[PDB]
Amino acid sequence: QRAGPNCPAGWQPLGDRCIYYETTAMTWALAETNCMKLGGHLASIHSQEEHSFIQTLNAGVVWIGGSACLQAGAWTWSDGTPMNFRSWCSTKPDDVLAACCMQMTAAADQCWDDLPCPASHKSVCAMTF
């Protein structure tokens, strides 16, 4: 008798860790809110190939990077520090109040590009224990 796979319940312990995914267009507001109630936040990437994962699914854009709309040139994670690895294309254009919620389109040629926040795109959430 040894009950204990990975996650507790109402989650998705794919492999070992725990991650979530959706399809219906639900931006930061719709995603983050529902995601918060679950227990986690907008997933991220490190192994790179994992980035290919969300790109392989294809279901809109993915809100993953953080946010910046109350400082002078300061981009970080959702609520921490910044990341690395990103040689898709040149740096994002502009960086004023015009955009507050970062965004990485998913057209293959769209390349990363900040957004103003309203753009109901699929949700990509991850988590651990």
Swiss-Prot record:
Main location: secreted
GO cellular component entries: extracellular region
Keyword Disulfide bond appears in the UniProt entry: yes
Domain of life the protein comes from: Eukaryota
Gene Ontology molecular-function annotations: carbohydrate binding
Record PTM: The N-terminus is blocked.
Task performed by this protein: Antifreeze proteins lower the blood freezing point.
Name under which the protein is recorded: Type-2 ice-structuring protein
Organism: Hemitripterus americanus (Sea raven)
